[PDB]
Amino acid sequence: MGMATYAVVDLETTGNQLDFDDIIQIGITFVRNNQIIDTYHSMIRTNLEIPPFIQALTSIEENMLQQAPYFNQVAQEIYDKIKDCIFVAHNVDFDLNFIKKAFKDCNIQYRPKKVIDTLEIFKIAFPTDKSYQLSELAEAHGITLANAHRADEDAATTAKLMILAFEKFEKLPLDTLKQLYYLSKQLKYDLYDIFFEMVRQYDAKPLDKFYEKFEQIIYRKQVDFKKPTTNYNGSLKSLYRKAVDQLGLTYRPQQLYLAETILDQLMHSEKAMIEASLGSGKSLAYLLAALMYNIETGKHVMISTNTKLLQSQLLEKDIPAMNEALNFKINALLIKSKSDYISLGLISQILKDDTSNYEVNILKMQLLIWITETPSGDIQELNLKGGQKMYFDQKIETYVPARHDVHYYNFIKRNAQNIQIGITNHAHLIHSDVENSIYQLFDDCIVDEAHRLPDYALNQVTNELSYADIKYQLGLIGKNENEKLLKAIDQLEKQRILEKLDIAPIDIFGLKASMNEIHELNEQLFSTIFTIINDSDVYDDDIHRFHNVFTFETKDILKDLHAIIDKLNKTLEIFNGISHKTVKSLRKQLLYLKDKFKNIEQSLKAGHTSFISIKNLSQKSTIRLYVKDYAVKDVLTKQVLEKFKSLIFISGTLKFNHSFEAFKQLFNKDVHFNTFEVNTSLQSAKNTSVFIPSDVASYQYKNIDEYVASIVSYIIEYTTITSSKCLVLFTSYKMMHMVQDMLNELPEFEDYVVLTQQQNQNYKIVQQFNNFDKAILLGTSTFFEGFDFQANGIKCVMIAKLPFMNKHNAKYWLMDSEFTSTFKEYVLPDAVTRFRQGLGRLIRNENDRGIIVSFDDRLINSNYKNFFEQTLENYRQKKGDIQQFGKLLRQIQKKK
DNA sequence: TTTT
C-alpha cells in the first residue's frame, strides 16, 4: 500500500446554511509522511450577496470574487486530487457536507473512504490546552497562524498540527494500541484506521522520562525539587533596596514596612491582622518577607489569595524578576486540595466500558496522553466540563484507593520542605483536613483579601440535592433490561439459567420494577418541593440568576425522602450475600444514591437550616435543596485559625468603627492578634473628592423611577462637562437595567458606549479602556472589589445606594443563627467594607485625580451614618444642587 | 432598621 495522503481542507462560505450558502474560498494542504507536500487554493465566485458579518470574519469582499471561477470548473480538477486522499478538516462535518453538496450540484459523487476530524485529534493530543479554536491553538504550540479566518492557514496550520499530533503519537507501543481500541467507539471518523497504520509501521525504542509504568498506564515521572537559596548575608532593607534597584521602581517606605511587619510576625509564632491599602505593591512585600524568612533559617510559608490574577502576577512575573536579582530561584508551587491532583486510579476508569458516552471514551484517551505530559497532575489542567466533568467528579468521589496507588498530591508532601514559598486559594484553605493534609507540613500562612474569607466559608458550608444529580445517578443504573447496569444483571441471570454459573438467583424483574418505583418516588419529592415553591414566598437573587424560597415546611419533603431511602434499601437487600463484581458494582451505585438521599434526610431531621433554590420557576428539573451542615465561624476557626502556627490576615478593609473587633468576632476562641495599619494613603486622600447630592430624593423601592431619573441626571451633567469615564455601582438589578435603557435612548450618550454586568464572563471591564477612554458608563451590581480604574482623565465612581443586604439573602439566611445582632455584627460591617472597597476603586495612581458621588441620603440622615462617614474622613466633602456639582467638575478639569 |  502506498502511504496515505491527507487532504486537509478548509472552506469559507457565505454562511452556515448548507442549502442556501455557497463556498467562496477553498484551501487544501496535502500531507504525506508528516510533511506538507503540496497545496491548492481557489477563490470561488458566487451570485449571492456576502453578508457584512461574513466579510468582516473572512476579509473577503465581493470585488475579490469577480475574477474567481465558479465551483463547476474547479470541481472537476479538485476531485481528482482528493478522490484518493484521506479527508481531513477542523470540525469536519461542515467542510465535508459543503464539499459534498457542491460536488453533487456538479454531478460529482464524493465519498472519501476515510474521514478525520482534527478537533477530536487536538482534544486527545493536546488535552491541557485551554482552547481548541485554531488560532489560539496555533499560537498555543508556536505555529505561525498568520492571518486567521483563511481557508489557507486553516488548511495549513491544521495540517501542521495534525503533523504535530502524529509526531506526538510516537509513544510506547502498547499505548498506541490502547487508543486504537478506544477509537472504535468515538464516531464514524475512521481515526482507528490511522492508529492501526501507525501500529503496523511502528518504530520501537525505550524512554526514561517514565522510570516505571502503573499497571497498564505509562506516566512522566514527576521531577522533584531542590533547595536553591543563597544567604543574602544582609537585612531585608538591603534586599528591598537591591531588588528595587534592579527592578527600577520607587523606594516606597510603607511597602517595606509591610514586609518587615509580616517577617517579624512570621519569625515568631504570632497571629496578626494587618490592614494595608498599598497602591498595588503588596505582592513584592509578601514574597520578599517569605524568601527573607527562607534565608533567615526559615521554613515553608503559605499565601492564600481571593482572586488568581494576583496569584499569577507574583508567580509568572515577580518571582522570575527576583530570581535574577537573588541569583537563585526558590522553588514555588501552586498548592491545591487532594482532589485537584490525579491518582493512577485511571486504570479503574480504563476498565469501565461506556461506549455510549462518546465524551467519556475521548476522556480516557485524553487522560492517557495527559498523564504522559502533565508535570503536576492537577485534574483542573484539563477544562473538565459537561458530561466529562460530571463523570470524572463522580469517579473521583467514589474512588477507593488501594495497592499503593501513586497520587500526584503526595508529590507536594515529599517536596514540602524544599518549597518554602507555596500559594493556594481561599476556597482550598477552608477545605477539610482529610483533603488538605499538606497543611500539616505548612504551619505558616499569609491570607490576602481575607475580608472575603467568610463568603467562601458560606459556599463550603452547605450540601445540596439536585434533580440533575439524581437523574444522572439513576441513568447510570439503567431503566430497562437493555440499559447499562440493568443489562449486565440480565446477562448474569441468563448465564445462571443457560451457562449454569454458580450464582444465586438474581431477580432482574424485581430490580427493574423497583428502579421504576424509585424514579416515581424521586418525581414525587421534586413535585412536592415545586408545590412548596408555588405555595410559598419566593425571592429573586441580585444577579437575577436563581429564585430562592427560605420559609417552608419540611414535613412532606422528609416523608418522600424516607420512602425513597427505604425502597433503595430494599432493592439493595435483594442482592445481599453476593460477591459477583457486576452485582458488587450495582450495590455500590445503589448505596451511593441511598446516601445522597439519606444525608439530606439526616440534616433535615437534625434541625439544620435549609432552603430551596430553583433556576427556572417553571421547570421542577432545576430544583436544588440546600442544608447547612456546618457553621461558618466554626469552619473559619477549626480549618484556618487552629491549623496554622502563624496566621497573618492582610486586607485593605478589615475594620468597622476603628477597631478589628468585628473581623475578630468571626472566630470562636478568643485568640490574641496583632493589629497594624499601613495607610500609604498619601496624596490620594486629597487628589480624590466626594459629593453628596442634596437635590436627590430618598431611595424607595416604592418609586425607584424618580431616583433613577436623578441618577441619570447626574450622569448627564458629568458626561457633558467632562468627556471621561464614569462607574456606577447599583444594588438593584432593576435600577441597573432602568438606567442603561434611559442612557441608551438619551442623545447626550451618543459616542458613549454604556456597559452593564452579565451573570457570567464579566470581560466588559477590558472594554472600559478599549478605545473608549473618553466614552464609557460601566454599570455594575456586585463588583465593588476586583476592578482597576485606569483612564486618561477625571474618574467618577457613583454609589447609587449604600451596599446593604436584604434579610432574604442566602448569606443572611445562613448567618442569622450565628450572630446575636446580624445587622450590627454582619450586614452593617459588610456594607462598610463593600462601600469602602468601591471608594478604593477610584484612586490607584496619585498622578491623576477623581470624584466620588453618593446619592443615598442615609449617609447624612440615618442613625448608623457615623460608620459610613468614618470611611470618608481623609476625603473632602461638598453637598449641593447639580449646579454646585457642575462648578466642582469644571474646577477639577481646569486644574491644569 | 434591610429590600427587588
Strand pairing partners for A275?
A651, A677
User: Which residue ranges of A are tagged as binding site?
Assistant: 276-283
Q: Identify whether A199 is part of a domain.
A: no
Instruction: From the CA of A888 to the C1' of B3: give the distance in Å.
Output: 33
Q: What is the β-pairing status of strands A6-13 and A23-31? A: antiparallel
Closest nt to residue A831, judged CA to C1': B2
Same domain, A779 and A863: yes
- The answer for residues whose C-beta is within 8 angstroms of residue A741's C-beta and 6 or more apart is none
Measured distance CA(A447)–CA(A451) in Å, rounded: 10
Q: Which residues of A62-96 are buried (b: 16+ CB within 10 A; e: fewer)?
A: eebbeeeebbeebbeebeeebeebbbbbbebebbb
Instruction: From the CA of A827 to the C1' of B1: give the distance in Å.
Output: 11
Measured distance CA(A588)–CA(A773) in Å, rounded: 60
Q: Are A157 and A31 in contact (CB under 8 A)?
A: no
* A301-305 sheet: strands from edge to edge: A332-334, A421-425, A301-305, A444-448, A646-651, A272-276, A674-678
Instruction: From the CA of A399 to the C1' of B3: give the distance in Å.
Output: 45
Measured distance CA(A701)–CA(A704) in Å, rounded: 5
Give the DSSP letter string of A542-572.
TTSS-EEE-S---HHHHHHHHHHHHHHHHHH
Residue with nearest Cα to nucleotide B3 C1':
A806
Closest nt to residue A828, judged CA to C1': B2
Instruction: Please name the residue that has the C-alpha cell 543563597.
Output: A230
Same domain, A598 and A479: yes
Closest nt to residue A699, judged CA to C1': B3
| Chain B nucleotides covered by protein, CB below 7 Å | 1-4
Q: Which residues of A659-689 are buried (b: 16+ CB within 10 A; e: fewer)?
A: ebebbbbbbeeeeebbbbebebbeebeebbb
> Helix, strand, or coil here: A658?
coil
Closest nt to residue A803, judged CA to C1': B2
Q: How many CA atoms lie within 13 A of A402 on its CB side?
A: 4
> Helix, strand, or coil here: A843?
coil
Phi and psi at residue A854, to the nearest 5°:
-125, 120
Q: Identify whether A218 is part of a domain.
A: no
A815 closest CA partner among A832, A831, A805: A805
Same domain, A619 and A476: yes
Measured distance CA(A511)–CA(A361) in Å, rounded: 28
Strand pairing partners for A678?
A276
C-alpha cell belonging to residue A587 = 450495590
> Helix, strand, or coil here: A744?
helix
Q: What is the β-pairing status of strands A332-334 and A272-276? A: unpaired
Give the DSSP letter string of A24-77.
EEEEEEEESSSSEEEEEEEE---SSPPPHHHHHHH---GGGGTTSPPHHHHHHH
The domain in which residue A849 lies consists of: 684-893
Which helix or strand (DSSP H or E) is residue A288 part of?
Answer: helix A282-295
Instruction: From the CA of A657 to the C1' of B2: give the distance in Å.
Output: 20
Q: Identify whether A470 is part of a domain.
A: yes
Same domain, A562 and A623: yes
Name the amino acid, one letter, at A718. Y
Measured distance CA(A305)–CA(A635) in Å, rounded: 18
Same domain, A495 and A624: yes
Q: Identify whether A177 is part of a domain.
A: no
> Helix, strand, or coil here: A637?
helix
Q: Which residues of A273-298 are buried (b: 16+ CB within 10 A; e: fewer)?
A: bbbbbbbebbbbbbbbbbbbbbbeeb
User: Which residue ranges of A are tagged as binding site for ATP?
Assistant: 276-283
Method: X-ray
Region label for A513, one of left (φ > 0), alpha (ψ between -120 and 50) or beta (otherwise)? alpha
Measured distance CA(A344)–CA(A840) in Å, rounded: 47
Measured distance CA(A662)–CA(A669) in Å, rounded: 14
A78 to A73, A82, A493, A767, A807: CA distances (angstroms): 9, 7, 57, 45, 70
> Helix, strand, or coil here: A303?
strand
Closest nt to residue A863, judged CA to C1': B1
C-alpha cell belonging to residue A691 = 459629593
* DSSP state at residue A749: G
Residue with nearest Cα to nucleotide B1 C1':
A823
Same domain, A700 and A846: yes
Measured distance CA(A118)–CA(A161) in Å, rounded: 9
Measured distance CA(A791)–CA(A812) in Å, rounded: 37
Instruction: Please name the residue that has the C-alpha cell 473512504.
Output: A113
The experimental resolution of this structure, in angstroms, equals 3.2
A45 closest CA partner among A28, A27, A17, A26: A26
Measured distance CA(A52)–CA(A148) in Å, rounded: 17
Measured distance CA(A571)–CA(A774) in Å, rounded: 68
SS (H, E, C) A348-383: HHHHCCCCCCHHHHHHHHHHHHHHHHCCCCECCCCC
Helices (H) and strands (E) in chain A, counts: 36, 26
Count of domains forming chain A: 5
Measured distance CA(A385)–CA(A396) in Å, rounded: 15
A82 closest CA partner among A14, A27, A35, A145: A27
Q: Identify whether A619 is part of a domain.
A: yes
Measured distance CA(A426)–CA(A814) in Å, rounded: 19
Measured distance CA(A674)–CA(A660) in Å, rounded: 10
Which helix or strand (DSSP H or E) is residue A698 part of?
Answer: none
Phi and psi at residue A770, to the nearest 5°:
-85, 75
Instruction: Please name the residue that has the C-alpha cell 503536576.
Output: A376
Give the DSSP letter string of A760-808.
S---HHHHTTSS-TTSEEEEESS-SSS-----SS-EEEEE-S-----TT
Same domain, A755 and A792: yes
Measured distance CA(A608)–CA(A626) in Å, rounded: 10
Measured distance CA(A802)–CA(A857) in Å, rounded: 9
Q: What is the β-pairing status of strands A753-756 and A776-780? A: parallel
Q: Write down which residue in A146, A168, A190 finishes a domain.
A: A168
Phi and psi at residue A493, to the nearest 5°:
-65, -45
A633 closest CA partner among A808, A805, A457: A457
Instruction: From the CA of A214 to the C1' of B3: give the distance in Å.
Output: 58
Measured distance CA(A492)–CA(A500) in Å, rounded: 10
Instruction: From the CA of A858 to the C1' of B1: give the distance in Å.
Output: 12
A646 closest CA partner among A219, A94, A126, A268: A268
> Helix, strand, or coil here: A319?
helix
A683 closest CA partner among A794, A846, A895: A846
Closest nt to residue A804, judged CA to C1': B2
Phi and psi at residue A415, to the nearest 5°:
-95, 10
Closest nt to residue A827, judged CA to C1': B2
Instruction: Please name the residue that has the C-alpha cell 495534525.
Output: A162
Cα-trace Rg, chain A: 32
Exposed / middle / buried, residue A893 (Cβ in 10 Å: 0-12, 13-18, 19+): middle
Measured distance CA(A876)–CA(A849) in Å, rounded: 13
Compute the C-alpha angle A769/A772/A774, nearest 5°.
105
Q: Are A445 and A624 in contact (CB under 8 A)?
A: no
A484 closest CA partner among A291, A337, A353: A353
Measured distance CA(A319)–CA(A332) in Å, rounded: 9
Same domain, A379 and A308: no
A748 to A561, A722, A776, A853, A855: CA distances (angstroms): 59, 12, 13, 20, 21
Measured distance CA(A297)–CA(A310) in Å, rounded: 27
Say how many residues make up chain A. Answer: 896
Residue with nearest Cα to nucleotide B4 C1':
A732
* A547-549 sheet: strands from edge to edge: A462-466, A623-628, A610-614, A547-549, A539-540
Measured distance CA(A52)–CA(A35) in Å, rounded: 37
Instruction: From the CA of A835 to the C1' of B2: give the distance in Å.
Output: 16
Name the amino acid, one letter, at A249. L
Name the amino acid, one letter, at A577. G
Which helix or strand (DSSP H or E) is residue A627 part of?
Answer: strand A623-628
CA torsion angle for A534, A556, A814, A701 (degrees, to 10)?
A: 20
Q: Write down which residue in A116, A137, A168 finishes a domain.
A: A168
Q: How many CA atoms lie within 13 A of A502 on its CB side?
A: 1
Closest nt to residue A738, judged CA to C1': B4
C-alpha cell belonging to residue A776 = 464609557
Instruction: Please name the residue that has the C-alpha cell 486540595.
Output: A337
Instruction: From the CA of A809 to the C1' of B3: give the distance in Å.
Output: 10
Q: Identify whether A1 is part of a domain.
A: no
> Helix, strand, or coil here: A231?
coil
Measured distance CA(A272)–CA(A81) in Å, rounded: 74
Strand pairing partners for A87?
A7, A115
Measured distance CA(A229)–CA(A300) in Å, rounded: 13
Instruction: Please name the residue that has the C-alpha cell 485551554.
Output: A130
Q: Write down which residue in A144, A168, A192 finishes a domain.
A: A168
Q: How many CA atoms lie within 13 A of A67 on its CB side?
A: 2
Exposed / middle / buried, residue A760 (Cβ in 10 Å: 0-12, 13-18, 19+): exposed
SS (H, E, C) A109-150: CCCCCCEEEHHHHHHHHCCCCCCCCHHHHHHHCCCCCCCCCC
Instruction: From the CA of A734 to the C1' of B4: give the distance in Å.
Output: 7
C-alpha cell belonging to residue A401 = 484507593
Region label for A876, one of left (φ > 0), alpha (ψ between -120 and 50) or beta (otherwise)? beta
Crossing angle of helices A173-183/A358-373, nearest 10°?
A: 160
Crossing angle of helices A484-497/A508-535, nearest 10°?
A: 160
Q: Identify whether A601 is part of a domain.
A: yes
Instruction: From the CA of A622 to the C1' of B1: give the distance in Å.
Output: 35
C-alpha cell belonging to residue A336 = 491545591
Strand pairing partners for A676?
A274
- Tell me how far apart the 2 most distant CA atoms of chain A are, in Å: 97
Closest nt to residue A732, judged CA to C1': B4
Instruction: From the CA of A544 to the C1' of B4: give the distance in Å.
Output: 9
Closest nt to residue A805, judged CA to C1': B2
Which helix or strand (DSSP H or E) is residue A251 part of?
Answer: none
A674 closest CA partner among A648, A700, A707: A648
Measured distance CA(A154)–CA(A578) in Å, rounded: 57
A22 to A70, A98, A393, A799: CA distances (angstroms): 10, 8, 44, 53
Instruction: From the CA of A729 to the C1' of B2: give the distance in Å.
Output: 18
* DSSP state at residue A856: -
Residue with nearest Cα to nucleotide B2 C1':
A806
C-alpha cell belonging to residue A861 = 440622615
A563 closest CA partner among A534, A589, A528: A528
Q: Which residues of A694-703 are buried (b: 16+ CB within 10 A; e: fewer)?
A: eebeebeeee
Instruction: From the CA of A555 to the C1' of B2: give the distance in Å.
Output: 30
Same domain, A156 and A123: yes
Phi and psi at residue A851, to the nearest 5°:
-130, 150
Measured distance CA(A265)–CA(A267) in Å, rounded: 6
Same domain, A668 and A701: no
Phi and psi at residue A365, to the nearest 5°:
-65, -45
Q: Are A119 and A91 in contact (CB under 8 A)?
A: yes
C-alpha cell belonging to residue A405 = 496507588
Roughly how many angstroms between the first and final C-alpha of chain A, as a whole number? 80
C-alpha cell belonging to residue A439 = 497543611
Same domain, A794 and A862: yes
A844 closest CA partner among A719, A687, A677: A687
> Helix, strand, or coil here: A703?
coil
CATH number (domain holding residue A498) = 1.20.1440.60
Strand B-proximal residues, CB under 7 Å? Answer: A 539-540, 542, 699, 701, 704, 731-735, 801-802, 804, 806-808, 821, 823-824, 827-828, 858, 862-864
Closest nt to residue A735, judged CA to C1': B4
Instruction: From the CA of A808 to the C1' of B3: give the distance in Å.
Output: 8
Q: Are A657 and A276 in contact (CB under 8 A)?
A: no
Q: Identify whether A189 is part of a domain.
A: no
* DSSP state at residue A278: -
Same domain, A162 and A102: yes
